[PDB]
Amino acid sequence: FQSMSVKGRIYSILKQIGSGGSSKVFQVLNEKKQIYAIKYVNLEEADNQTLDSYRNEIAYLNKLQQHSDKIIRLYDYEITDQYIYMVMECGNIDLNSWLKKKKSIDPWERKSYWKNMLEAVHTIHQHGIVHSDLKPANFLIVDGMLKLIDFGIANQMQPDTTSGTVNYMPPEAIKDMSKISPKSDVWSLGCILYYMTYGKTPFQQIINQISKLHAIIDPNHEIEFPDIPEKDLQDVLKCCLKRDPKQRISIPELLAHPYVQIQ
Amino acid sequence: FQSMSVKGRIYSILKQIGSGGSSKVFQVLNEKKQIYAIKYVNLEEADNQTLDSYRNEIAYLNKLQQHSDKIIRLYDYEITDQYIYMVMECGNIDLNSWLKKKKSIDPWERKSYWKNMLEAVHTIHQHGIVHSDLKPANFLIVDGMLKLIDFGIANQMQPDTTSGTVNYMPPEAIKDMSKISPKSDVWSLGCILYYMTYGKTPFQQIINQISKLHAIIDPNHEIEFPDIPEKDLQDVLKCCLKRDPKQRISIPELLAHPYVQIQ
Amino acid sequence: FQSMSVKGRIYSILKQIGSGGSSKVFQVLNEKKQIYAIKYVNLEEADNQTLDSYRNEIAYLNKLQQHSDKIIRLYDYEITDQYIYMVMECGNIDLNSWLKKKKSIDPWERKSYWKNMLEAVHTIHQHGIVHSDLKPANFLIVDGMLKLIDFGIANQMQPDTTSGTVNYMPPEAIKDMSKISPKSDVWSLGCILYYMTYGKTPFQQIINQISKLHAIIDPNHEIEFPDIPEKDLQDVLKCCLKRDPKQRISIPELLAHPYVQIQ
Amino acid sequence: FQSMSVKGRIYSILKQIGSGGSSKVFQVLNEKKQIYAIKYVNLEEADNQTLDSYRNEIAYLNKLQQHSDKIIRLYDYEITDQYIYMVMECGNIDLNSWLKKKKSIDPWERKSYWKNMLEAVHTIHQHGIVHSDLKPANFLIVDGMLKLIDFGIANQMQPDTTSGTVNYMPPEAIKDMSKISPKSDVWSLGCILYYMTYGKTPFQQIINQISKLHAIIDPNHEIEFPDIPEKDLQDVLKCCLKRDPKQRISIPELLAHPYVQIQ
């Protein structure tokens, strides 16, 4: 029912898609009645560290545009001491919501989504970012292609309604409680691909968390990998989910793997 | 994830908004990435009477375009023995969904929505249609303005989900079981406006239906009309909900009423 | 968490099962930790007609105890100008809730439930009651046996939650808008048995109500009765759903029918 | 609709309350129509370690009966190579479900529930059990009194429906990834009491888990303790939530605290 001004241009709000604190995301239309998203952050209560965090993202989000189209596009922004408005691409649905809704995944679409994920994470790695907390919520399906989103410092973004959070955590990040590396995202991505392969994360079955945390770090807990028709798929998952990050496969390695390279 | 061709032009589907049988409505985008709706009817099982019913609507929907913008616009259609595709305006939400979600209504917005409703129903009346079953579901909020929708013969359209039906029935339509007239829509509209005024339909409190049906036809059941700041509002409702259709106010009368004419 | 006194005896409340206005039903335990229900009516606002209605039920409920155990038992009650408390049998679930939850019904259980329904309705008929609004909500599953409940004048009882209403209406009751007879309950019961047979009421498919009301009274709307293994079942339904109440089967007839009498 | 035999005595099932794998809990009635619970474990797939785990619980559950009535009572059991059936007390609701439903808690009821929790945990401690994973789900409200439940080795018990998991984890248990002690339950209990005091767990606000795990172990993350009318309450919480288990208050200490000892 409402509207907003970013850098002179007027946008009419269709619906609130999601929110965190003090952030909200809207699906909007521009003067040409074209579909975009606008992220709104209320700064009225933000401390220095947090201000800096939102500045860093906008900056990286700007820089990364040029180097890959598998990062959500930012078109324009207004930023004051009171508020941020960022005009952005609007996808169809996030990967997490989508995975929960899905009967099953077509091997072609899985492989294709895998390529997009690799490219995105490979990209942030080349620019010195190591996410360390990747999850399905960090990907947006836009025109059949996944793009990285919500990849910044403190990003508790969740869909809204009109009425796992640890299954992806890499082992080295647990033990560490100087020891988080690019390899940690490989774990997390592997967990997502495992999900897309077996309909479940490697420890979705363990519902107590002390017990689940234990299982992730424990090498005498053999993870299961039932045989499937795609042997390459099977080897990628096996290499992604090696607990010793040093023996875990790298992103540049994964991009040379037959699973992604051979038709 | 999908797409469709109507009269040469390609449309990509965002989401299914609603359905009946064998109809479905989609929110789609055109080649210029602009937002529209497409109604799809599957004819594979339609009998003559039903075929005729869908033809009548498309025809009326076409004719009524020229005479009022408070009827949903049809832009183009493809019709075969197998299917109908109609490209149409896409509103924000239907009135029924909206009323259920709403805290309360701003008197200005109520009055404005009332004007739109009158104009729409007045329009169909001038073209020999007498709906006889009007309800909140028959109105679509498009850019702050209500437009008549789903007003055709057999139209069981309902919103879809990702997981009253008699409060509006006019008394003469009950007794009749040669006796349905324009006045019957005045009743129904009054019931909607009563809802928008008092947060409830005149017999929402009576949940048994034999009992509710009885109450609608019974003149010794005084309907309540608590005093409000808007006396004109109070008189319109009182005149709309007179049980004797002959003593009920007409649409051309209602358009001259101070409630709609005086600021 | 609470407790209550009826005629000297103390009852502790387990949970609220359901409510209307100004009535509520509780699942309670007695001093011997045995399971009962207590219906509570708040009289603080009851008019004479309504007072009388609640008195009539308690009276009939008392009288009918002696003549059939397919009417819910009342054990004791306290009644003042302020409140009624009735201590009653507590069943497992009502028939309506149960039907909505059910995969499918075992022919033996259907037939058995049919016998109980007939006996109950036959009973009220012998005592000059003609319900005229029977529905699945009017039956309570208690130890594998249906018992009639909520059969009194103004009884808008509905289950509570921790977070059709016209499919059963007999045709003569519609036309009548001196003409309601025992036969009307036969219709309604038939509709319930039809539901238990075909998974659906005879006009569950017609969702518009003007249209559904029309269909119930219209003799050129042939109701469907797909062949099933139980031909007796098929004939009972056909005889219950005859629109001319005079040509409709009677309860004493139905009790002599092979469906209920032959193993 | 069904029934079961434990040690000769027949029990009729009212409803399934909850389940895990391969366990289920039922609300049942005995031959005297009195209300009990029955826990059913299907052993058809249990490995030695798990068999042993279920044996240990039944044994402890038996022994602890004699020493405190704030542990759920076991009355009788049948145990074979195929199944376990345990007849048990049936409470009203578990603490977790109850806390989620609650407007707010009466200080008297909070204190009383606190006493019960202390007594229960104190009891298991005297018998060499150190739970190490206490949570609201581990307590059952039975006749206004909390009793410890589901306190055994692998107990993933969850309520069923007819349609946090880490907020309680003690810091020493995180760092430990020879170092879990009685003090760890004091943490967890404190977190529950904090919840009952402030409507929220100390880190319910941090929704990312890497971040929440970090916060629990981090001493430069001052936990908040807004002043309340009950200063004793304030000191208990402060003493329970000290991160250095050595400087954390003990159960025998907590039982001498003015909060529990002075009216």
Ligand SMILES: COc1cc(N2CCC(O)CC2)ccc1Nc1ncc2c(n1)N(C1CCCC1)CCC(=O)N2C
């Ligand atoms: C209609 O567009 C969307 C719909 C949905 N959902 C439909 C409802 C269902 O329950 C699942 C979520 C989810 C995502 C989108 N598209 C979308 N575009 C851009 C962003 C964004 N999300 N989000 C969503 C906010 C919550 C999750 C993703 C955050 C990333 C971002 O910066 N932007 C701009």
Ligand SMILES: COc1cc(N2CCC(O)CC2)ccc1Nc1ncc2c(n1)N(C1CCCC1)CCC(=O)N2C
């Ligand atoms: C995003 O667009 C809409 C969203 C909603 N809802 C959001 C979900 C919520 O639960 C309530 C319903 C409801 C209506 C629209 N817009 C809309 N435009 C055109 C038509 C149409 N509806 N519908 C909807 C189908 C179900 C009710 C109206 C039928 C009328 C029609 O011919 N067309 C083309």
Ligand SMILES: COc1cc(N2CCC(O)CC2)ccc1Nc1ncc2c(n1)N(C1CCCC1)CCC(=O)N2C
């Ligand atoms: C646990 O006992 C019950 C549970 C349920 N439900 C479980 C919840 C689910 O969503 C469906 C309803 C439904 C009925 C019962 N048992 C029951 N006994 C006696 C009466 C009674 N109902 N009710 C229920 C109140 C709402 C419907 C029936 C009214 C009839 C009556 O006078 N009494 C005393």
Ligand SMILES: COc1cc(N2CCC(O)CC2)ccc1Nc1ncc2c(n1)N(C1CCCC1)CCC(=O)N2C
């Ligand atoms: C009617 O009795 C109950 C109802 C509920 N709920 C009502 C539904 C609502 O959504 C929340 C849960 C919860 C607990 C009980 N009573 C109850 N007694 C004994 C055990 C037990 N639970 N449970 C429940 C199973 C799931 C949580 C507790 C496990 C502990 C145990 O060994 N026994 C025997």
Ligand SMILES: [Mg+2]
């Ligand atoms: Mg949702």
Ligand SMILES: [Mg+2]
């Ligand atoms: Mg929903």
Ligand SMILES: [Mg+2]
């Ligand atoms: Mg919805």
Ligand SMILES: [Mg+2]
């Ligand atoms: Mg329910």
Ligand SMILES: [Mg+2]
């Ligand atoms: Mg529940």
Ligand SMILES: [Mg+2]
């Ligand atoms: Mg529920």
